[PDB]
Design a protein around this ligand. Sequence first.
Ligand code: ZN
Ligand code: ZN
Ligand code: ZN
Length: 178
Amino acid sequence: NSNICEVCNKWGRLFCCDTCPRSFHEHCHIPSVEANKNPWSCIFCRIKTIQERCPESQSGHQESEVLMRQMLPEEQLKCEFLLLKVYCDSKSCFFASEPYYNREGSQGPQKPMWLNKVKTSLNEQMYTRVEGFVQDMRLIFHNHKEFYREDKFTRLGIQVQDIFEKNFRNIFAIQETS
Ligand SMILES: [Zn+2]
Ligand SMILES: [Zn+2]
Ligand SMILES: [Zn+2]
């Protein structure tokens, strides 16, 4: 196995996947690495299994259909994986914890949002449809763009949103378009 966490790229107390060479910190994995379970398969492996059991799941889909899906176990897992892929980018640090807003010439957002809040919401089964999760994820980046206005720091929001959107289209097999 790898000797660094797949998500944060640091060593430490690592749990090793039994079906691939990836390793994780306990709370870097989503869901948090399960207490017992031998063998244990990571989220990358569990998502690969879904695909392999239903090859047709990789045919293209319309976003509008994906968003209306109820959060059954497979869609829960897909959203957990998508959230994890965002944490995998080091620029997610900016968006992880609860923000505050005190900048001359800007007003903070009406509905603040951050990664760790989405993570808690998924853990507590607060989303009933994929749309709930995706709306909160997109709101993170939209709030940032709006608040930072012409400051070059706005770009961090564009960058992390692009990671989110590419991974959303991959994980949920959104139909490719120009
Ligand atoms: Zn880690
Ligand atoms: Zn694995
Ligand atoms: Zn099938």
